[model samples]
Target: APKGTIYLTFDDGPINASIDVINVLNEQGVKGTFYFNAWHLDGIGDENEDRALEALKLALDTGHVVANHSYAHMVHNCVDEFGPTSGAECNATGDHQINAYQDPVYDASTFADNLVVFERYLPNINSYPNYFGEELARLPYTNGWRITKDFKADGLCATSDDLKPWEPGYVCDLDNPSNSVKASIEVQNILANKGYQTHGWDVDWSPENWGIPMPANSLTEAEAFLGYVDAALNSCAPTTINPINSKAHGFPCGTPLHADKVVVLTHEFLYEDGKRGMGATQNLPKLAKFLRIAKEAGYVFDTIDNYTPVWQVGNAYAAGDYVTHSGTVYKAVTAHIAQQDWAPSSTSSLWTNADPATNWTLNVSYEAGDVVTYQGLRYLVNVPHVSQADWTPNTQNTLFTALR
Candidate 1:
């Protein structure tokens, strides 16, 4: 087992750059999660986004998780002059704000609407292997997370009243965050209530100088970037971000879902070889080198959804779904929205303990919710069935789902 885990996530794309990024990930034999902005695929984003639909399909075809980054990236919320249909125009105004996070109800609706756009453009998205629905998301221009009730944290300095963190002389008081930050916190609450797990990065793989056109030329080298990964896993370096994103550094490091893990944020546009400069020529090779080095360093790469198998409130868990609570794994026996009082340990009617010591054997009758080990992996029973030589957990996915 690896001592640490790295979740490589690409955001703000589905452009021509995305196709190359997907190819890089496939070549590296690692999976990446894409936080996609549907507007790019809807023919209303950048000029370089002409092949957005192809990129989206290729991402899923290659087994990369396609998740929500929000439709229009909250640009419609930032300015009232344009709605979701005008993301490109809204971004050009250079007047983006985080007011979208101000109202929880409306914010949730915007995120939900984003899913609508994705479904409209890619009607067959759900048919893909790694499309995990709207379960995962990330707020644009903000570093924030609502992973679980006890494991929540936020980056309060990402954006403020009239300045972004990248702007010159931009300062933010972590103790007294701007209204945007405060509202973003509320928006996270609303999303969590809707069963969405929003994530933030522990390390950002970006150029040192912000507001620069050719970010590819300015990025830190692979070896040096690995140092930051080590720092994040060992010291919880979310607060250690160069430009000062706060509060997140103090997030509980050893929590159930986040222990010994680092989520890295990188954008797809940085890998494109266009007006942005020799990103394809310079950064693509750098990304390949980084992935190779990181694997050699004894770290495992995984999609963000695997960060936790732990239960969360408001999540509509279905039969055979697995969750960890109180250091013990449990398989859901019924479909229900998790309630405060219905913890796995106490709710016998709803959950079944996945005891590791129990191994499957022939001739024993098994009931639904009964978990048994099969060839070193835990398997959850789906229904009452008789054990036989031919009917094995490995073969009968409909009857037994792997818990881990």
Candidate 2:
């Protein structure tokens, strides 16, 4: 039985540091999500960004997700250099302000500009064998969310219109947030309207003193970090302001697809060996150690896309609802909240394999020349395609050739 899920997500990456991060994940046999800012791909960021394009391609090839974190990361909002629509002026300087999405025009183009870079570079990105392209995103500075219609929240203290959250004399009143926080909320709505499910972190794996030499100055060791993850899972830590450093953007947990799930935020630049200190040498080991410890403690790591469709604990399933467990589809036999011991395969009384093996089913991914029986007749697939309910073998002659 597993305790919960840990979604290790990296933001503002696809830089050279990401290569090592991806390699570490690959070596550990786990998948992660890279919330990338494509500006680096155009030779615009730090020296580590020189290999940004290669890093992007490598992440997709190695079964990692390259999601949008906003193209220039709202840098133009603060700096006079980067502008109306994608330029090389702002860098990391302007990304922390509220005006990043303040302007009606710039706010609207934020997501679209980020996506255009991917479309221009990886035109066939959607064709990748592994799930590469997704509409998932997170705001650059603010911890905000638009997961589902009913599930939403925001971090009131994430950023300020004038002073940065970490700067002196900066205060955010939840009762009356700054104009920038309000603008960010509207921006989240804009993203939601554009068919995106923006996510926020449940815990941030960052240094105790972010003003110091990268992530190495952190007092938190691997064991302590693992304890943070455990605390979040066991206590629904997001609903409370328990941990100052890794707190979520204030959302209701233990609901719908949110129960027993924790998202850990990290930045790729923190693990790079540079002026930020030897994070690659120091923090990388901690990452691997934490992964091992968490796995031993029965926590499963997964990419964000699998957050849905995949069977999870804490989700209530109605009878006849389908979920995938270890690559096999199962239908709920009775409505109940998923239990650790009552996995779909283990609890026969609670769930059943969707159908008999020989029959064609909508859940199966059909490849050309594969054969399956439908309505007592066998048919060969004419082309590779995912199964759909209405595209049964009998009616869709073009998709499935009759072998009778």
Candidate 3:
């Protein structure tokens, strides 16, 4: 019930330096969520790329949450649906210009496509990215917020007519805005429909060197950065950050109220060994100290995974009530108390459906046109499903067949 919460999320990493970053958190008995791009894992990148996969494995194996940051990190700019590792055409210029969501050509599948690497490294590394940590995500080139539940009161204001550092030059059409924003929102919707929760940031833990990996606020001056946090806690967030004189339009819904927490944005590459600037070794201590200071100042450090639950601990559940965990959607099985011991995962008997397309469970009604997937094949319902315990739709239900 405590309102002050901090989500330390680092993006664009799983690089070598992430080990130190992870080590810092481990020493403090805390965990962080890491957003990673699967480029290096695919063997398309440089030699340092080999270290990327290990960093990811290290992050998850050590209890840190890993998320999808995109495969090529938008380098490919595929105009088509989410598939393939790389592409030539970009949405910005479909004529094949070197661009990204800025040109805005994608569907809900874009997010799913971004996680193709996980398909190969299944189980131990759940690559099937979904929404948690509010199905947590922060679109590149833009610091946008799209948490559906609290948007009405979020008080965030920013529009297309703003200059963003991520990508500059194009004029925003206010009415239409950026195509990528629309596309990202579309992806957000698609993921949400499947029961994912996403959110952007209220502030960022930026490096001093804009082009490198040193904190802009400086290691010794973390308390000063806290000043920025105090300002951003309930203030307006820009579409691209640092909006001037309220020029960027924000919605009425303000910080913490939108989710009752501060979402901090950061990058793992900022800590990567000195390939660019001061790497993780130099910066992790600053981060660790900053975290400690914030906590001492009443900020409780938490991973994205520990937010307030949509499902409750003691509330009585109805048959159709839904709860999302680790990105898997689950519907209540029988009316029962949401006891502490009873969770909503495959291992639990309280809910139907858990874990990677997860476990298909009991009492999740299936109509004649219903569908479910297992082991990569799709199946459709041929008959009605009630408690459906006998019809395990796990690949061989006479009532279901490969619809695709």
Q: Provide the clashing-pair count of each candidate structure.
A: 0, 0, 31
Q: What tens digits encode model 3's per-residue C-alpha lDDT throughout 115-201?
A: 666555544454423322225544544454443332321112222323442455645455564554555444544455455544456
Instruction: Give the per-residue lDDT of model 2 (tens digit) for 1-404.
Output: 78999999999887999999899999989999989887787766544787888888889998987776877777666665564433334544445464555674575476678778877887887686453334677887767776643457776766566765556776767898767667777777666555566777777888767566454556367899999898888565655643331234557665556778888888888787886777888888888899899999999998876764778999999986666565444667789999888887633677765421335766454668877777878899998765677788999988899897
Model 3 — TM-score against the truth? 0.64
Model 1, runs deviating above 4 Å: 83-93, 97-100, 166-171, 211-213, 245-250, 310-346, 349-404
lDDT of 1 by residue, 136-249 (tens): 788877777766434577877765677755669777887888777777777776666555777888888887665576756787778989888988895656666666643363
After superposing candidate 2, which stretches have Cα over 4 Å from the reference?
83-95, 129-134, 213-215, 239-250, 310-316, 319-404
State candidate 2's TM-score.
Answer: 0.73
RMSD of each: 12.9, 12.5, 8.9
A best-first ranking of the candidates according to their lDDT comes to: 1, 2, 3
| Highest lDDT model number | 1
Better candidate by lDDT, 2 or 3 = 2
Per-candidate local distance difference test: 0.75, 0.72, 0.55
Could you tell me the lDDT of residue 237 within candidate 1?
64
- lDDT for position 221 in model 3: 47
TM-scores, in order shown? 0.74, 0.73, 0.64
